[PDB]
Amino acid sequence: AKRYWNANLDTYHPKNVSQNRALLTIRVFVHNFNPEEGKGLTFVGSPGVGKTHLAVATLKAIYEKKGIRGYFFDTKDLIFRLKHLMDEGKDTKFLKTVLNSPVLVLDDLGSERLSDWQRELISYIITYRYNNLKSTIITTNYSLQRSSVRISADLASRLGENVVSKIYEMNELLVIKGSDLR
Numbered sequence: 001a002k003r004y005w006n007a008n009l010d011t012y013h014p015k016n017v018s019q020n021r022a023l024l025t026i027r028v029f030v031h032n033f034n035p036e037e038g039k040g041l042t043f044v045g046s047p048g049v050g051k052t053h054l055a056v057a058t059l060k061a062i063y064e065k066k067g068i069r070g071y072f073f074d075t076k077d078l079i080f081r082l083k084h085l086m087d088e089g090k091d092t093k094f095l096k097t098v099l100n101s102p103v104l105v106l107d108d109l110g111s112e113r114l115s116d117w118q119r120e121l122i123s124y125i126i127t128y129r130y131n132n133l134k135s136t137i138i139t140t141n142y143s144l145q146r147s148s149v150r151i152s153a154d155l156a157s158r159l160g161e162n163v164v165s166k167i168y169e170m171n172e173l174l175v176i177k178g179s180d181l182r
Ligand SMILES: Nc1ncnc2c1ncn2[C@@H]1O[C@H](COP(=O)(O)OP(=O)(O)O)[C@@H](O)[C@H]1O
Pocket: 003, 004, 007, 011, 012, 013, 014, 015, 019, 045, 046, 047, 048, 049, 050, 051, 052, 053, 054, 139, 182
C-alpha cells in the first residue's frame, strides 16, 4: 500500500526512453479515461524497473483528475484473501466490490507458478472484467531479455492462453526496460 506513498506521476522522473514513453502514454490514458470503456494498461519488465510505481501513480492520477476511486491489490494477497471468504461461505460483498470496481490494479500478476484454484480466480476476475468492460491495470514480470508474443506465451504458460488473450484485447502493453533494478 504505502511504500509508494510518494508514487505520483509527478515524483516520477523517467530514467530512460522506455520510462518516458510510458509516462506520456499514462498521462494521455488518465486524461481520456472513461470507466465505461474498460481499457487498462499492462506493465511488463524486470524487477526494480518501476512497474508498481507507475501502476500506483496511474491509480492516483485517475482519482485526482476524474475522482474515480479504484483499488490496488497484490495479486497473491488478493487471491489468498478471496480463497478464504470463498470457503468461509459468507462474504460476497468483498468479491463484488473487486469484480465491479471501476479501476483495479493486479500487481505482480501470477509471476510464478499457481495452483488450480489460483488459476480459477485469476481467470474468473479477468473474464468478468473483460465481459463487463471494467478497466484493469496489470504489472507483470518478464523473464528472458531480448519477443512480444513471447511476453504473451510466457504469461500464457502460467495463466493460460484464454486469459492472456483477453488481457491483450482490453489493455495496452507498455514494456519497461530500466537497468540496475531498484
Ligand atoms: N522513475 C522513478 N522515480 C522515482 N522512483 C522510482 C522510479 N522508478 C522506480 N522507482 C522506485 O524504485 C522502487 C522499485 O520500483 P517498483 O515500482 O517496485 O518496480 P517493479 O514494480 O517493476 O519491481 C520503488 O520504491 C519505486 O518508488
